[PDB]
Design a protein around this ligand. Structure first.
Ligand SMILES: Cc1nc(CCc2ccc(F)cc2)c(O)c(C(=O)NCC(=O)O)n1
Ligand SMILES: [F-]
Ligand SMILES: [Fe+2]
Length: 208
């Protein structure tokens, strides 16, 4: 369970070099399947509008909370070494469902205009996923780098990449149901001025 070694000796150098880092078998089969059940259960609450946002404290979402906690640990152990960013917080977890009728997601930059988000963190929970059959590959186009990077939404896979213009990415069509959980980490300075100019933050919330 050497998270400090994983962070300093793998995640950090990997991100500084490529701006993309893949960590396989993050939480183990049992934990990953637990997350799968929690995520599929979100449907029966009618939470999906498909995406839903999870804080982690919700009843029936505590394994998701475990994942988020683990994610936070790795980031905490990195602190100060991921670029010149200073991570002071994150978003809630966004749970995405691609129904699997050829539905993907068009090429886009997560944070093109500086809303504070510096690192994207994705966990995939698709048990026995085969991208040969079911597709759903995430293709990232790292800025200036040669070829693109194809990343299978493999079960229990954790992915990190820069959120800014350096990593335009698209999700290729899914031919089976494809779930992912995403958290975005905030850089202190970028986030500070983002609250100044954008309708983001607590003030960004609608009241009845
Ligand atoms: C469903 C989904 N939505 C967004 C952005 C939506 C958004 C817009 C504004 C916001 F403020 C917050 C979120 C993504 O970027 C990805 C993605 O990149 N998936 C990669 C993957 O699953 O492999 N998927
Ligand atoms: F806030
Ligand atoms: Fe994205």
């Amino acid at each position: 369970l050497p998270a400090l070694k994983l962070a300093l000796e793998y995640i950090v150098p990997c991100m500084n070099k490529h701006g993309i880092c893949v960590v396989d078998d993050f939480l183990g089969k049992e934990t990953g399947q637990q997350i799968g059940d929690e995520v599929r259960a979100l449907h029966d609450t009618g939470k999906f509008t498909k995406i839903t946002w999870i804080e982690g404290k919700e009843p029936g979402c505590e394994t998701i909370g475990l994942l988020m906690s683990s994610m936070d640990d790795l980031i905490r152990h990195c602190n100060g070494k991921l670029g010149s960013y200073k991570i002071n917080g994150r978003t809630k977890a966004m749970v995405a469902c691609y129904p699997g009728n050829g539905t993907g997601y068009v090429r886009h930059v997560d944070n093109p205009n500086g809303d504070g988000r510096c690192v994207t963190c994705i966990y995939y929970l698709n048990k026995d996923w085969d991208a040969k059959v079911s597709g759903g590959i995430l293709r990232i186009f790292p800025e200036g780098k040669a070829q693109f990077a194809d990343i299978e939404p493999k079960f229990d896979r954790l992915l990190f990449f820069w959120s800014d213009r350096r990593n335009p990415h698209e999700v290729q069509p899914a031919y089976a149901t494809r779930y992912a959980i995403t958290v975005w980490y905030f850089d202190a300075d970028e986030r500070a001025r983002a609250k100044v100019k954008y309708l983001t933050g607590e003030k960004g919330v609608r009241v009845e």
